[PDB]
Design a protein around this ligand. Structure first.
Ligand SMILES: Nc1ncnc2c1ncn2[C@@H]1O[C@H](COP(=O)(O)OP(=O)(O)O)[C@@H](O)[C@H]1O
Lengths: 496, 136, 68
């Protein structure tokens, strides 16, 4: 007998069609079963097995029925209306082009908006198996973990990288190589998808090889519904207990949000939910009470005390200190710029991000006040006998650096004239020598996150108005958008 | 490439023009290709659902495919300014329209310029300068 | 005895504060010091190379710069 058959037999099996490989197969196979399991006989011994599972023909009859799919996406994700309309385009298009084509998509947005899930769900629809493949530091493995050559790889993070192109290049991806196993491989039918945050670190080479979709973040309204119709139930069911076991009143959900999460995604949201799902359970087992109702008063008896300040209910107005809306890799944020006055020379030294991009802008809001002076109420003998310090907190992404012009300006003035920025106002806008206010990037996310921290007024570039259109109903409704073209316009509304 | 028929989708000339004037200010045609695909895509989803064997994008349809307008192409909104000229410059990526600005603050004959540190610029600057110095 | 406890020994100092810090091993009592030598506005700090510190340092600094 001998195990000279146990393997060999299942080798000539229907599985293992391609002969380009079978060569290297029986080759290292008809090797040295002579002799026993020597220190040598343990080596290649295994090399054969990894080789047995790798798929070659197990194709997953791809069902492509939009009528479903599109409305399976509405079963496992709340909003993302526009983002779905584009997942289906990527299918109705798929159906026709019977062979998947080069452009494979990246999902991009703050973490916790669903990128990973959308993918899993794209695949649920296509009935292909799904694989996460993290790139924080190897597809080799991939297939194995799905022994079916028609999968969905999710190149999770392509941007926490320190070149691989080969794997995706439409021309080359067909014939695929890999050291320590050297042998071509066909990846024709392999839906690839990518997650991502700071679209920068991505290699120009790649970002062009891939088609991009942005998931955006969420209005208080949206989050709330996500909580109710997906988040909560999921956490109930996962902490094993009944819907009849625990309910949270809307207003509390809201509170959980405003006061325990300042994210754009819903991850922190999910975690605080579970907090409760958990606290809940311990009751259901001890006290046994079949019901637990968390309310806007109970909340503290579950998730701790309040964690973020929401609103200027709390805060009082300040001097030479403005609140600019910035575009963080993780959503709208509310970084505050400051300015300080110490005797000296016209020189101005700024702190925070070393910013060579900033100085240009800074010494422009600066070079503005240089001009229109008495007209603004400030001792013209200043740039001669003062020394101005500016702080621009890191977070704003490159493209958006210059979007802090009207901010530093406003501060520098409010600082020079002893006035005071209205705590309520968040601003964003690019400055020019003359005092012009040029167009800004991503007003959407900016006002979104401006609302999240609950501001009232949000001064922005005039030439940005056609951008307010797409700002979700809920938030555009709680903000008075003051639009402006020159500093004086900004200054008048942001100072008191 | 989006697998579908020539008989599946046609764009009228004027729309193509519009796609260009209003959704691309490049010298190449990469941005142009992308916006085309945008449509090749949108198109397909129809051909699979609605099944309509034809889709005709026009100068009025355009928004129902590639979004709203993206760049301005004229001098409608833009109105005249002071000490601010629009110079044509030769970018590594084609003709561009960079605008130079000048601001007046009390002081000394010194002139400090911003943007590109430019040692090449000062020479020129302090020459247009040194011109007005004369013919005043 | 091995450690001191309290102020039966220590006696007040100058330009030397005792900050409460969060060590991987609990609350600790690290003391910050400052020394004055003639020269330029430049400020050089010791101990942890700290790029995080300079920002803060040249801020307590940039404070006294003002209210003088
Ligand atoms: N629109 C949404 N609908 C339902 N769940 C969501 C949604 N967005 C985020 N989630 C939460 O995150 C998961 C999918 O988002 P996730 O993939 O965690 O975000 P990311 O992948 O961007 O970190 C869901 O299972 C749930 O945890």
């Amino acid at each position: 007998t001998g195990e000279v058959q146990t393997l060999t037999e299942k080798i000539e099996e229907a599985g293992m069609p391609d002969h380009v490989k079978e060569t290297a197969l029986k080759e290292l196979n008809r090797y040295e079963k002579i002799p026993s399991s020597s220190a040598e006989s343990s080596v290649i011994r295994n090399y054969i097995d990894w080789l047995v599972a790798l798929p070659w023909t197990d194709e997953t009859d791809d069902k492509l029925d939009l009528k479903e799919a599109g409305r399976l996406l509405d079963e496992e994700h709340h909003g993302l209306e526009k983002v779905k309309e584009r997942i289906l385009e990527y299918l109705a298009v798929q159906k026709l082009t019977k062979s998947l084509k080069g452009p494979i998509l990246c999902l991009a947005g703050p973490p916790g908006v669903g990128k990973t899930s959308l993918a899993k769900s794209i695949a649920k629809s296509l009935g292909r198996k799904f694989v996460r493949i993290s790139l924080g530091g190897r597809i080799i493995q991939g297939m194995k973990k799905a022994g079916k050559l028609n999968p969905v790889f999710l190149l999770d993070e392509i941007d926490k990288m320190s070149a691989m192109l080969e794997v995706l290049d439409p021309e080359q991806n067909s014939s695929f190589s890999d050291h320590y196993i050297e042998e071509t491989f066909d990846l024709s039918k392999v839906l690839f998808i990518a997650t991502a945050n700071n679209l920068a670190t991505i290699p120009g080479p790649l970002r062009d090889r891939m088609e991009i979709i942005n998931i955006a973040g969420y209005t208080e309204i949206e989050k709330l519904e996500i909580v109710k119709d997906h988040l909560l139930p999921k956490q109930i069911k996962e902490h094993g207990l009944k819907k009849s076991n625990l309910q949270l009143r809307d207003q509390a959900i809201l509170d959980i949000i405003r006061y325990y999460t300042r994210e754009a995604g819903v991850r922190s949201l999910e975690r605080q939910l579970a907090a409760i799902c958990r606290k809940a359970a311990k009751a259901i087992v001890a006290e046994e009470r079949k019901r637990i109702t968390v309310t806007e008063k109970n909340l503290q008896d579950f998730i701790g005390k309040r964690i973020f300040r929401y609103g200027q209910a709390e805060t009082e107005d300040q001097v030479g200190v403005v609140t600019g809306l910035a575009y963080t890799t993780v959503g709208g944020d509310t970084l505050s710029i400051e300015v300080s006055l110490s005797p000296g020379k016209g020189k101005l030294i700024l702190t925070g991000k070393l910013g060579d991009v900033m100085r240009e802008s800074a010494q422009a809001a600066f070079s503005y006040v240089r001009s229109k002076t008495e007209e603004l109420g400030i001792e013209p003998d200043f740039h001669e006998k003062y020394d101005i310090h500016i702080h621009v907190p890191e977070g704003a992404v490159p493209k958006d650096g210059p979007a802090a012009g009207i901010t530093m300006a406003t501060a520098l003035v409010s600082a020079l004239t002893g006035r005071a920025v209205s705590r309520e106002v968040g601003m964003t806008g690019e400055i020019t020598l003359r005092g012009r206010v040029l167009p800004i990037g991503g007003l959407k996310e900016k006002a979104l996150g401006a609302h999240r921290a609950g501001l009232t007024t949000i001064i922005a570039p005039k030439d940005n108005e056609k951008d307010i259109e797409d700002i979700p109903e809920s938030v555009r409704e709680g903000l008075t958008f003051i639009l402006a073209s020159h500093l004086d316009e900004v200054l008048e509304h942001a100072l008191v």
